[PDB]
């Protein structure tokens, strides 16, 4: 007769306005069809009343009673239509129907019916490959997909749920100034790039190839995550930083209310001790904003205090040590660039006709390898390098033509000591050299030194290295390889895999907040004259450098074992648990990452078989095949030709692709992301820019190295004002929202009705817990101290799976969520 159902929803900001004829639902049959084969639809059914029974009821949520006339002729409900007749939208959580129970997991904004082209349809929590879809739901499944894809035209609106691709043509602002014009990134051979979410705002007036600015950069609506607590809206903080807080900081400098430069290292440490005094109206501009009220401690009047960075919590001075400089290449913010070095001297692939002779000036006899010969070091696999020579060299001339930017293309040679720690043994600071250079600056090699001006020169050499490293980290390791590389897979998934699809359910938790942060990023973070361009060395060249890097991006080399082998920091070895032997045995990121990688592998390998018995079952999944084809040929379309893309005709291939996508989105992004403020919150430890080359022996600047080495250093790195802005942004990006969903968690316990999938998932969480105890034990092992803690005494907890809220230096979210 009647089916008792409970609707749980969330009003935008009494429940009684929801009763009456405000909201109707219509059940759809999974089993009885009409003469066109489509599931039969019941009658419009309105909310009956507010349920106060249910005690399991989350915050902001409210439950409503409802009764469906559902009869013999109608069969089993497999979906439902919902119409919202109210003017304001509400967030639908779920429908439960009792009698056994049917569960519908919705988690979607429902706008006023008149705004929707066709009626919002939701499905029950059963999982089906396309060939298993009940026949009465087949056309409903596929029409919902066509609806999500749209038609590639039109300006997207807030309530749209249309997923499509476009190039990075929305970063420049040529209508405001030709100086803010930028190259379109994506869709050419000069500038290949991942695609991003189409917004459709239309061309600028001055350039038909650049998209006009907008106050809100659209994402499909359910990608724009709300938060119950405003403190958790960390992604919007990036937008307030650009629009409100940065200008407020600038004004204090424009009005000469604070010294323009740091004059000593204590001036930097003061930021997290007594604070910085700023004008009352600057404070009062910043202080009441959500996020920025959590970012800084304040007296409400003139003081802002930054949190004390982890890297200085035990020793203020230990970042200066050569031990920590090298340790952070294997356990720092950017732990995935170091390579094995198997010949000496190191070589370049770059054209000597353009840049001059590219031969290394580092001589073997000059290096202290703890009594080893070069041949012994090379052969024992104890020689490594941090090589930014070929990466940076093509951009040095252009960067150094900028006002107040000067860099080298750096190389660092490291030696793996018998005690298992790395030490740095030389830094080569390279400059391009063509006839008809106006500059007389030359390349040079700097070797470690603990006293005198040679010590300062060596500290300045590490700084140039770390400028290189930070730019690479922020633009490549971080932006390109996580945020940018993942968005095409997000878009493809929603375009081609139905919410009913097992691989949809598998992957989509690993996309939470990714489109949203990326869009806010295109607007405020990587835009023309945005945060990154105004805080980091390459200025207007930054994002385009990441395009140049993308030329060499290989999907299958994002797999952790493949990465470690390609970089020469491990070798394949089947006698081992993970199939590889580390050449740096206490390499924290890699050792811990392999543990996470294996756990994700086991989980995918257990999930996939539940839905695909054989390789044929993969080949014949038409959604799956359309998904992958588009993700490659459209989403990463500039690399579509490349031979290394898995073909996706086998269970092996499906598992491989899912495993890698999940790896990028969770542990890789975590390992590169949540260290930014812990390590970089001391600007001297992770400088973002350099402003001068090394001084000539005859000059006042050289005498400053002798007489005031802290000032020389500070004059060389990021200025005070850009430091304040970059500290503020990395502080945001290193903070876990209280409402994050971590690896081994899902936002709903009823995401599927398949108990087998649910039990596999619980084993995965149990393993991650198991892994966490093991990493604790590694951090507590006194013989691992040198690489896992260092002289900074900072336990490597970046790949601990779990965390509480905040700036914690641990915790692996499911997704790229900040
Ligand atoms: Fe991030």
Coordinates of C-alpha atoms and ligand atoms in Angstrom, one line a residue, residues 478 483 669 818, ligand 1:
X478 CA 52.6 20.4 -6.1
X483 CA 46.1 19.8 -8.6
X669 CA 49.5 15.4 -2.5
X818 CA 43.5 22.3 -0.3
Ligands
LIG1 FE1 47.4 21.4 -2.5

